[PDB]
Amino acid sequence: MSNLCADPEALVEARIDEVLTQYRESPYLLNLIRAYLSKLAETSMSYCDMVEKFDLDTAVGDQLTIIGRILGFPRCHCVCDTIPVVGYDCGGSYAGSYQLAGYCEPGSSWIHCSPYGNSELCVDEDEIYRSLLKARRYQMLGLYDIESLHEALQIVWGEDAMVAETKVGQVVVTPGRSLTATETRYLPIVFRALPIAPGIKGMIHIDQGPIAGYGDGWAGYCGGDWLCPVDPHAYTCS
Amino acid sequence: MIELEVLDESKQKFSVILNDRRVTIELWYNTTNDRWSFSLALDGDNVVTGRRLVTGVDLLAPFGLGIGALFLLSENGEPPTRANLPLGLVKLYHATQEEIDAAISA
């Protein structure tokens, strides 16, 4: 569409124009009416901030959670992983049985959190959950071909990502770059969102670097590496 | 299929027997967005309320009411307007499910 609403003063003046001649120059009456109507107009302006807060390319927070709930990919998932816990390691080091967080960790969770006491790793950084939803809208439509899987991987990981092999029931992918800790920890959730046909096992390159070999779009000596598909353990501990 | 006449009034209401059901339709014009909207009541109960009249799609598809398709058409795909809907430049049509099936098969 286009601009839904207008400035409140435009609407209120449009209405003040309808006043009677005998009141056209009553500054106290007109200013009282303006005071009372300018708030209704201002209150309702807050609604045109309900228009692009759900834009998948820009949504954040609860607006992104609601889109995730529409697309059927919640923010958090069960895993076989020791999520980092917010807390102090008794200074230098303490024996304990947990691992700790330090003000910059997507694995933010307190030991008392409900989506932590039952092993739900919850995705907090919007830039990664947005990518997961942009990939999930491919599982939605069942676009399992390479032309679509490569496009999904570009959004998840970057322009260097690629899909390598198509064995019997086993497909390898690579980000094409060293991953950071946040991306490594979220990796199991990425293979739950990628468009890979059920009954076919997704794998991952070891070094997350571009694959080598012969052909047109590949990597040579500098930049490439020998393939090695490994199990990301997206659904199992084993 | 049938054509449903629209009067030159910003709010109008009528009743028609669709698939042997008494369907009451209420059209009202929203000046702020310059668009027509419809509420539909099946046998006295409002099943659809506040839907935007848009050309070229089945307006009743999401609801599974079982009363066929209700759709708007125009020669060059113009959008419905206060002036252009009552003039017959945009026509409201009801199509029965069997007719839709026969056309789809043909």
């Binding site: 009372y36 919640p74 069960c78 939605m140 029931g169 739950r192 059920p198 076919i200 | -």
Partner: protein, 299 residues
């Protein structure tokens, strides 16, 4: 602008805030000498219009929640699900359809489209989807790179036309029932599981453990009726699930925490109950009767 649509949701301006800034607008107009007490002519007007502004905020919250499957309800919930072309079943509740839209965990998000469309098929009482995506046959007997479907009810034609369009070519299917399907002349045999029901006889011994001597245990008939409901519900034991002491001790104690399960006994009817485990194969299922369930309290 902390109010309105915020990263935490829709933040609502309090009525007191509305009234206070109405009063600020009126002080800026009439001067500091104005009277605005809640019982004066100007105070009453301020209250009325503060209420109207707050009701506009209420509308804003309604409009925001009309796009959250957790708050949307009715035909608007149906339109929301129309983004993924899910459909509500007959008599399905908003809570159930909402859980289907959201895909609450499910621990494996894919195969959710197939699972939900199967459930939507008319007549399908119980449905379940399995997959063997490794290069080895799993302990349940599913060959590698295979999709298995278990379904009770529904016509084979609709079931198979759905399963064919949800499972890609080049992926097999493990099952006991075969359905021949045709599209454009191409001829796929879709194998599904129609689990064979084994009438199970179940006899349970329980001890009473009142919570802080809080309230005493219920009656034997009530506990047996609860267990029959639990085992006949949508969370009934699946195919290939052997009857064990653990399963029933997990069901009884959850249904009635003040009761300790001591000894479970199972058998295939009409055979006498005995020691578990009762082994069901992957094509078999446990089927229960109200009469067969028996519960006894022991000292």
């Amino acid at each position: 602008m902390t109010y309105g649509v915020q990263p935490t949701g829709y933040v609502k301006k309090p009525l007191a805030v509305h009234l206070a800034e109405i009063e600020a607008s009126m002080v800026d107009l009439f001067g500091p000498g104005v009277i605005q007490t809640e019982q004066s002519p100007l105070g009453q007007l301020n209250g009325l219009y503060a209420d109207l502004s707050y009701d506009l905020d209420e509308r804003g919250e309604d409009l925001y929640q009309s796009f959250d499957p957790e708050q949307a309800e009715g035909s608007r919930l149906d339109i929301l699900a129309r983004y993924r072309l899910l459909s509500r079943r007959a008599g399905e509740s908003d809570e159930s359809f909402r859980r289907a839209i959201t895909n609450v965990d499910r621990a494996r998000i894919d195969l959710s489209d197939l699972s939900t469309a199967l459930s939507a098929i008319n007549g399908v009482s119980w449905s379940r989807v399995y997959v063997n995506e490794d290069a080895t046959t799993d302990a349940d007997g599913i060959p590698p790179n295979t999709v298995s479907v278990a379904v009770i009810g529904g016509d084979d034609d609709e079931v198979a036309q759905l399963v064919r369009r949800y499972v890609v070519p080049g992926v097999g299917m493990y099952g006991n029932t075969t359905i021949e399907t045709t599209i454009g002349g191409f001829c796929r045999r879709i194998r599904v599981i129609r689990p064979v029901l084994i009438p199970t006889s179940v006899e349970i011994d329980v001890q009473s453990r009142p919570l802080k001597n809080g309230c005493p245990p219920p009656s034997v008939n009530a506990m047996a009726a609860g267990l029959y409901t639990e085992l006949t519900g949508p969370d009934r034991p699946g195919n290939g699930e052997d009857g064990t002491v653990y399963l029933f001790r997990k069901i009884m104690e959850r249904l009635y925490p003040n009761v300790e399960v001591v000894d479970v006994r199972l058998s295939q009817a009409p055979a006498a109950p005995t020691t578990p485990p009762l082994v069901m194969s992957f094509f078999q299922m446990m089927s229960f009767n109200a009469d067969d369930i028996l519960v006894e309290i022991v000292p």
